[PDB]
Amino acid sequence: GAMNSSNYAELFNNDIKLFVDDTNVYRVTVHKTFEGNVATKAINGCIFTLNPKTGHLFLKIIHTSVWAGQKRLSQLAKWKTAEEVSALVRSLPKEEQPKQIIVTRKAMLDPLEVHMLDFPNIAIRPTELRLPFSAAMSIDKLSDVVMKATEPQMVLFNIYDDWLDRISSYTAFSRLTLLLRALKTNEESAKMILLSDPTITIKSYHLWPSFTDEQWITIESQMRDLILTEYGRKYNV
Amino acid sequence: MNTVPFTSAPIEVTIGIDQYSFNVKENQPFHGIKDIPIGHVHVIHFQHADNSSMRYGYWFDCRMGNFYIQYDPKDGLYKMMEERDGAKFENIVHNFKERQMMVSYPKIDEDDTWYNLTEFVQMDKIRKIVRKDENQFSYVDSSMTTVQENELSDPAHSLNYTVINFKSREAIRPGHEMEDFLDKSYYLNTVMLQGIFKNSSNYFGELQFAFLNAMFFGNYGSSLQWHAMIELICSSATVPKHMLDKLDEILYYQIKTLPEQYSDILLNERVWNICLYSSFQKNSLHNTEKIMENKYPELL
Numbered sequence: 001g002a003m004n005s006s007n008y009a010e011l012f013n014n015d016i017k018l019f020v021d022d023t024n025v026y027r028v029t030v031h032k033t034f035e036g037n038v039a040t041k042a043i044n045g046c047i048f049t050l051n052p053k054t055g056h057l058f059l060k061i062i063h064t065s066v067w068a069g070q071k072r073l074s075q076l077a078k079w080k081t082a083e084e085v086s087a088l089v090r091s092l093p094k095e096e097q098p099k100q101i102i103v104t105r106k107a108m109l110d111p112l113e114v115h116m117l118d119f120p121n122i123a124i125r126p127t128e129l130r131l132p133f134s135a136a137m138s139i140d141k142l143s144d145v146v147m148k149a150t151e152p153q154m155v156l157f158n159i160y161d162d163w164l165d166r167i168s169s170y171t172a173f174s175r176l177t178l179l180l181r182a183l184k185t186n187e188e189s190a191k192m193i194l195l196s197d198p199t200i201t202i203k204s205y206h207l208w209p210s211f212t213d214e215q216w217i218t219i220e221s222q223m224r225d226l227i228l229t230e231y232g233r234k235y236n237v
Numbered sequence: 238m239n240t241v242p243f244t245s246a247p248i249e250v251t252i253g254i255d256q257y258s259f260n261v262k263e264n265q266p267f268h269g270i271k272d273i274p275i276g277h278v279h280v281i282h283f284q285h286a287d288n289s290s291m292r293y294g295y296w297f298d299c300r301m302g303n304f305y306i307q308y309d310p311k312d313g314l315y316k317m318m319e320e321r322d323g324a325k326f327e328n329i330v331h332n333f334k335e336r337q338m339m340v341s342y343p344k345i346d347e348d349d350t351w352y353n354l355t356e357f358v359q360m361d362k363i364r365k366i367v368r369k370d371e372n373q374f375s376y377v378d379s380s381m382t383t384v385q386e387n388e389l390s391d392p393a394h395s396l397n398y399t400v401i402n403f404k405s406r407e408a409i410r411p412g413h414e415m416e417d418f419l420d421k422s423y424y425l426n427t428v429m430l431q432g433i434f435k436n437s438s439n440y441f442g443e444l445q446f447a448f449l450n451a452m453f454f455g456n457y458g459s460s461l462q463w464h465a466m467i468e469l470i471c472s473s474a475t476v477p478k479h480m481l482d483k484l485d486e487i488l489y490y491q492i493k494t495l496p497e498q499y500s501d502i503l504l505n506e507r508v509w510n511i512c513l514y515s516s517f518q519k520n521s522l523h524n525t526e527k528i529m530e531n532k533y534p535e536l537l
């Protein structure tokens with residue numbers, strides 16, 4: 001059923017599973033028109049589909065042309081997401097297909113279930129985890145590929161860079177969710193923490209800086225401090 | 238008019254005949270029901286006084302044979318049987334009528350209730366939902382499960398209603414997922430009406446039979462089927478106007494007949510609120526909406 005803190009180690013067992021986050025599929029700016037009404041302008045979005053054990057990220061870029069002349073876009077976006085996840089599963093070899101797809105928002109359950117009727121043995125599950133995957137577009141190289149896209153595109157990333165050479169997938173997922181939560185909570189400060197030291201760089205083939213083990217401990221502590229600082233600011237604590 | 242004689246009434250029992258009911262005492266001189274209107278199916282049903290969990294009955298059409306009731310002390314129930322000897326049957330009925338040992342089917346002349354509840358119900362269609370081909374009448378009880386209930390256990394004793402499942406490949410055309418899930422018209426008109434039922438009359442017949450089984454026997458699966466067949470229509474953007482108008486009449490008379498005190502066990506809040514206020518057909522069921530709001534405003 002639902003995925004929560006009790007069964008958290010299940011994320012890192014050997015059953016292939018994917019998280020699907022649709023928050024960034026349909027993205028708009030809201031603005032006034034010449035006549036003083038309000039209108040939206042869509043901007044490119046993306047589906048965030050992640051294997052939490054391996055770090056493999058299937059980033060389907062959603063180009064604004066898919067909304068042209070369509071109605072009820074927030075509803076359509078869920079179904080487009082489900083359509084694209086279904087198409088990804090069908091494109092994968094059988095031995096790579098997931099056994100479970102965990103959606104971060106419960107409104108994705110019916111669209112994905114309906115698109116996956118042909119796969120009765122793939123479980124479609126919600127989660128009680130509050131996962132900060134909306135902040136994916138705060139990762140500069142992901143935001144760049146999404147905003148530069150001129151057409152629908154799928155781009156493959158490993159969101160853990162090379163961390164699994166040194167740490168477990170449990171720990172890598174914990175590091176990722178801490179980084180994304182920090183970027184969600186105070187993006188400017190989080191990015192300052194990550195890039196403050198010029199001598200630590202991001203490899204061409206990576207998303208995050210090349211921190212040593214001890215530097216990651218420092219960075220992780222600074223991110224926890226940021227989150228706690230912002231909590232105190234928010235709630236006057 | 239036709240007659241269902243009883244050999245005897247050895248156990249105290251509440252007997253239903255269609256929407257009517259009456260109590261018979263243990264070993265009372267009761268020998269059946271006369272003046273049953275020809276032209277309709279009927280249902281004769283039972284709830285034992287000493288054991289309210291015994292809820293069962295028989296659907297029958299007096300045009301199809303001569304039927305009587307006899308209590309079986311081994312199986313502990315009133316059984317319907319057919320009498321093939323016509324003159325024997327007539328002779329039995331006449332004796333019981335002359336001695337005034339029968340209750341009269343108490344139909345008011347102004348009263349179309351039973352026709353309105355069974356307009357589309359045919360005995361031949363009942364015998365396909367309830368499979369026991371050696372009898373011309375059909376036994377139903379409180380606990381019988383449906384084919385769909387059995388997929389989610391004795392198959393011979395099941396209610397073979399048409400399976401309706403909105404998240405099934407039958408309901409959803411590949412490539413039309415959003416369309417078919419948000420607008421059930423394909424599933425209603427092509428799959429169900431053109432494909433399985435062949436016409437709206439058979440669809441309404443099954444809907445009406447499900448309602449009656451749920452109400453008269455407290456059958457849960459029947460209640461589920463009735464609601465699913467309502468929701469399939471209401472959740473379709475494209476429905477023939479004659480079907481919408483007829484559904485409004487069908488549902489009005491069902492809501493009118495429902496005991497006021499059984500609304501918590503016979504009406505699904507989600508389905509009715511969705512059908513009356515959110516669905517494509519939210520403005521198409523004027524008579525049903527008016528009786529629901531005046532009779533069961535709590536549910537809504």
Ligand SMILES: CCOC(=O)N(C)c1ccc(N)cc1
Pocket residue numbers: 451452454455456457460502503
């Ligand atoms: C015996 C009275 O109950 C009913 O008449 N119905 C249809 C019903 C309602 C709910 C359940 N679970 C089972 C049966």
